[PDB]
């Protein structure tokens, strides 16, 4: 005999699309500071175009993950799929954002004047939920054929017989025992919503991504307070106190330390962005091969003879 179990798998997809005004960071409304910044050349424009490439890359990450399907499918009103109750994982139209209850738990479990700006993501959370609703709609109704082309519509008992024949189990086993499988799947759905309502230690990776980004920004803000050997960290104090050459020496020290701090921050953001890009390509691979079809790669999609997964929208990530 056997059992059926669902398993979460949480992958970060994109970062927070953060842009830094470099001249405003180093020289906040100062003329002599902007002069000495332009003496140093095209550091500032290069860092701006680098961070812009980062933000475009995370937007491309979100787009290349979530936009695999073109035709946005929608569930039929007769929700009777063999006793498999998908009510928690389907989106809720009665909630003002058309999101799943599971996605509400996922969003619940996740927690200025210096040129530090945050660009919005291109895809909002509701249309990301609409993409995932399309993916579950095609997966439930059409089976795996919607990733291959047209949505060839199939019954759900036929679909589970086909997935069991994909893992080698003959279809008479499921057709003689479908109610036990349905009850086990519904109970596993109950356990996964209980586990998501339990604690955020599963979502500690996504929270760690946001916390790393916040640590980097906060360390950059604290590095604004650093003197780097100057007599003040406030630029306007040095401009008020000193003669212009004697001010400009301290301004050279401040631009030197702040440019090193910005290069450090851009370097950390670049390496973390490459890590997030690799994780996004991994997530896109997992969704393309496990959502859109039946993978026979063992341990690529959780322990066991894999059948399918169902995506859920997460803040800056996806969950299968």
């Amino acid at each position: 005999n056997f059992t059926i179990s669902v398993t979460t798998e949480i992958l970060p997809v994109s970062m927070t699309k953060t842009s830094v005004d470099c001249t405003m960071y180093i020289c906040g409304d100062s003329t002599e500071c902007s002069n000495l910044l332009l003496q140093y050349g095209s550091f500032c424009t290069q860092l701006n175009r680098a961070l812009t490439g980062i933000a475009v890359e995370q937007d491309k990450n979100t787009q290349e993950v979530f936009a695999q399907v073109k035709q946005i499918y929608k569930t039929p009103p007769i929700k009777d799929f063999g006793g498999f109750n998908f009510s928690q994982i389907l989106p809720d139209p009665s909630k003002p954002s058309k999101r799943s209850f599971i996605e509400d738990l996922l969003f619940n479990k996740v927690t200025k004047f210096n040129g530090l700006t945050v660009l919005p993501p291109l895809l909002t959370d509701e249309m990301i939920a609409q993409y995932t609703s399309a993916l579950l709609a095609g997966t439930i109704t059409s089976g795996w054929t919607f990733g291959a082309g047209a949505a060839l519509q199939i019954p759900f008992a036929m679909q589970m017989a086909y997935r069991f024949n994909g893992i080698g189990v003959t279809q008479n086993v499921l057709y003689e025992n479908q109610k036990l499988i349905a009850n086990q799947f519904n109970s596993a759905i109950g356990k996964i919503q209980d586990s998501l309502s339990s604690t955020a230690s599963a979502l500690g990776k996504l929270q760690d991504v946001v916390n790393q980004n916040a640590q980097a920004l906060n360390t950059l803000v604290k590095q604004l307070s650093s003197n780097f050997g100057a007599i003040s960290s406030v630029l306007n104090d040095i401009l008020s106190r000193l003669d212009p050459p004697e001010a400009e020496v301290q301004i050279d020290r401040l631009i030197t330390g702040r440019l090193q701090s910005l290069q450090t921050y851009v370097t950390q953001q670049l390496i973390r962005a490459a890590e997030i890009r690799a994780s996004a390509n991994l997530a896109a691979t997992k969704m393309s091969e496990c959502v859109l079809g039946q993978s026979k790669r063992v341990d690529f999609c959780g322990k066991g003879y894999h059948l399918m997964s169902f995506p859920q929208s997460a803040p800056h990530g996806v969950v299968f």
Binding site: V69, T117, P120, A150, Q153
Partner: protein, 118 residues
């Protein structure tokens, strides 16, 4: 008073015991949404993270947008603006639209219906 960045956030007046909260002035980046210079010279300014008061005006979640006539129709995205809004150059003038997620396709599921590739 001080802020989180060791910057002066609030002051007290020296002549009169009055407490003043200092906020720096409303600022944001300037983005230009344009098609190619082969096609036109018409530009649309996207101010970032400010409302369209402190600056053919449409207000986005990304900020103040000037020069894009906002359309309630939905197209595929050509120039991404932010928060689901995209721009295109059609009759011509720069327009803004909520970008389309695609075409909806209802699926005729039944407990005995199939679709076979003939």
């Amino acid at each position: 008073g001080r802020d989180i960045a060791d910057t002066t956030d609030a002051v007290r007046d020296p002549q009169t015991l009055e407490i003043l909260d200092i906020t720096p002035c409303s600022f944001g980046g300037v983005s230009v949404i344009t098609p190619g210079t082969n096609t036109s010279n018409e530009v649309a300014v996207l101010y970032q993270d400010v409302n369209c008061t402190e600056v053919n005006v449409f207000q986005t979640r990304a900020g103040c947008l000037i020069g894009a006539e906002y359309v309630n129709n939905s197209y595929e995205c050509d120039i991404p603006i932010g928060a689901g809004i995209c721009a295109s150059y059609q009759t011509q003038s720069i327009i803004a639209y909520t970008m389309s997620l695609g075409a909806e396709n209802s699926v005729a599921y039944s407990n005995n219906s199939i679709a076979i590739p003939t």
